[PDB]
Symmetry: D2
Subunit: 201 residues, 4 copies
């Protein structure tokens, strides 16, 4: 019953694919442009499906059409208990995801200006996450890194996906941030996540 | 106990100011640069307050420091019952807010390219909201326009603030969208919102 | 007879108005939305005037329509001898103006009081122009050769634009501040600036 | 002896490589990160070579360092007579290249298969260049005068870049498609293209 529609790219779909992998949820991963014309296939999709904003990702669960990648993430995270276990932890997971969006946007919008990115913004943002993880030190041992409380949240997956994307371009980016480094390794090594990354294009 | 910190601008704070107005919540509206050097005042702020990402808005409630405008909105909307009354309506309010962010971003990032904005993106996005409101037609009379369910949500305020900002620059923007037009008028005329807009710089 | 058409703003028209000031050329400064707005006026403009890209600035000289601010700037500079007096200096003038468009764009899109702009981009680009000025002498203050180029008026416009938002931006850049002062006091530009709104 | 330094990409180097092809000038095409990467190499470059803005492309001729792609393009075009043979044609060539940078930027930042780009910007700008071509004759295919300018090679580069992502972009623009074909078949460019990766 579940179909995720996106272009043939990680981008705005990949966090949702990571959540379904973590959760072991079966779905069809529909990708426009894998073979044919992405724009033609997308245009033909918009004809057949009622989308609210003529954008993807779209997640269809039975007859229910959901749009807006962040809103899908939040909905799924709430339904499947990866959103934090207190009103404050839920807020913190959301705050951290929102910060991931700021720096992921900068990464995505270059990086033609890469020295400023490489020397100023990326280190600075990395330090912000390093400090957030330090604050949660505190639930551990064991091991257990999480951004928020004592259990995985979508904020863990989002920060993983951010630095997974960054490391593809800039391999040494986590050398100066050992907590953030340990976090990324911890997440990448979760059975369902490791499995998914192995299978992935 | 509540202080909102931002620059002397509407921008990323204004939806939070609209929510506190709607809710009748007392707070201090702290604005950097009202008199002095905004950057100096902001730099001095970051020295005195522990911010997660060295950005504003920051909302301080007692000793609790909250960052990330969307996350603050969502937290406040949940605590004060303006987030929708079903798991699906909560998702829809979030989806609509996320769409508002897409078009508000386009508006904010010009609009040096204004004919494409004016003739393509803005009408198209306006039509998306017009259609969402049509879908909710349906809870009414009475009157009651809402995007989501039978009661106000932050999505109503966000869409109001989006078109309030747009109308300042482009007064006739809602002429072809009468539902969206009726919605904006309905929100602007809510006692606490009308009051706030009257008082506003 | 010469008409410059733009919106009511400095923007992509300002350097052209500065060259007209410097050279003491008389022209009509048509600004949309006085008047106003804007808009509408601009949509009427496009129906009346045959622009190549439906953009402004437009510089009309008699019947002749010129578009593209940087092309307009180059054309005026070559005609009125503020483009360098060697092939190499004409290139350096050009190169320098292309550098200006680089940080000017960052300044225009760095909103607002972005720390990275103030602590990384702005200091770095300021260092570039300081270094370029240093290379051509502590004054012989000219970026290129030993007379004014449109590159001087471009760097002046840049830091003037910046300064309005970030006072004391030229503090750690002695040749650059001195260049900025030199240019602002040339009588024609001094006058243009006092009378500008 | 001539070395063009850039990253391993078309980007802001491509039009320069196209002019070198067209004029049959021999040069070394140094691309960072073959090799590789990237990076590192580029940080080493900047320590070794005295660049004015710590950016590439850099074109070195003997000892002489040239930066800023558009300044490099103009300088080559003026030296090798592909910049127009009148003051007005030199301006139109320039104006047209400035128009190219406008939609090229939109194409480069419109990610990806943006509908507004395909239904609004691209058709509109294509209309502009069609109109410009029409104005200069159905071939006399040249944007400016009656010989090749760097403006022809700029419009060729643009639509070539586009075409790789959006096949059939030139369908409703007969002079523009014919111009694109004319240019792609000039022997020097035909050859450059087959051998390009
Ligand atoms: N990280 C990815 C790349 C980024 C990416 O996903 N790019 C997209 C386009 S933007 S993704 C497409 C875009 N969607 C949105 O922008 C959705 C915005 C909303 N706020 C949300 O988060 O859901 C959209 O639908 N726009 C349609 C329109 O505007 O007409 C793509 O098509 N890549 C494939 C390729 O190039 O082959 C990767 O490295 O693989
Ligand atoms: N709509 C507003 C204008 C937009 C605006 O708010 N601009 C801000 C700057 S961006 S707002 C300042 C920015 N914050 C953010 O970008 C927060 C991003 C996060 N994703 C969130 O949503 O909270 C920030 O803190 N950055 C600091 C840094 O980067 O160093 C401003 O300073 N205006 C006042 C003026 O010009 O006088 C208006 O019309 O009045
Ligand atoms: N930085 C300036 C502001 C920038 C500015 O000039 N803003 C313009 C918008 S872009 S200026 C208008 C724009 N032109 C261009 O973008 C010209 C680009 C070309 N490549 C060139 O360089 O000439 C244009 O014609 N648009 C095409 C379209 O609308 O379809 C404006 O209207 N300002 C007043 C206001 O806010 O009301 C300042 O300090 O005031
Ligand atoms: N559209 C192209 C890609 C664009 C491109 O060339 N990308 C570059 C980045 S910008 S090219 C590198 C950039 N130069 C510039 O931005 C030069 C701007 C100047 N105004 C001019 O025009 O010359 C620069 O030097 N940067 C300054 C810094 O890093 O600090 C690159 O490295 N690509 C390969 C890759 O992805 O690895 C394509 O089709 O391949």
């Amino acid at each position: 019953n579940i179909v995720l529609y996106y272009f043939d790219a990680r981008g705005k779909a990949e966090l949702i694919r990571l959540i379904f992998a973590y959760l072991g949820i079966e779905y069809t991963d529909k990708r426009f442009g894998v073979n044919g014309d992405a724009f033609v296939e997308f245009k033909n999709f918009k004809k057949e499906k009622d989308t609210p904003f003529e954008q993807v990702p779209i997640l269809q669960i039975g007859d229910l059409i959901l749009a807006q990648s962040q809103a899908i993430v939040r909905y799924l995270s709430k339904k499947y208990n990866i959103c934090g276990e207190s009103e404050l932890n839920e807020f913190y997971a959301d705050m951290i995801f929102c910060g991931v969006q700021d720096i992921h946007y900068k990464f995505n919008n270059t990086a033609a200006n890469e020295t400023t990115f490489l020397n100023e913004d990326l280190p600075k943002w990395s330090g912000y996450f390093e400090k957030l993880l330090k604050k949660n030190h505190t639930n551990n041992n064991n091991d257990k890194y999480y951004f928020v409380g004592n259990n995985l949240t979508y904020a863990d997956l989002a920060v993983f996906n951010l630095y997974d994307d960054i490391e593809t371009k800039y391999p040494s980016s986590l050398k100066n941030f050992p907590l953030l480094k340990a976090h990324n390794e911890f997440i990448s090594n979760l059975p369902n996540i490791k499995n998914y990354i192995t299978n992935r294009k």
